[PDB]
Amino acid sequence: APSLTDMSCEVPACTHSSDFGGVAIIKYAASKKGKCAVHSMTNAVTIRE
């Protein structure tokens, strides 16, 4: 699988809006082209993608 490294993040805006009102951006570099899964370790914050 593709492996990331040297990734880091920003949250340009956030709101409590019930319907994915928070938006975030992650910079990265990775070892190849491919498809990559994402998940949140914190149950208090659900991720749409």
Partner: protein
């Protein structure tokens, strides 16, 4: 004859004054509250 100067020449706050109907214009006094609701199509995402 004895008329003096009309308010167009003498009035405070640098205003202009006119008739039909009688109006004062451009009094430089106080402030003007404004609200504007521009369409959401004018924006572009900060992530772009």
């Amino acid at each position: 004859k004895e008329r003096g100067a009309s308010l167009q020449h003498t009035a405070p706050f640098g205003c202009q004054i006119a008739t039909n109907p009688v109006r004062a214009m451009n009094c430089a006094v106080g402030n003007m509250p404004i609200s504007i609701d521009i369409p959401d199509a004018a924006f572009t995402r900060v992530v772009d």
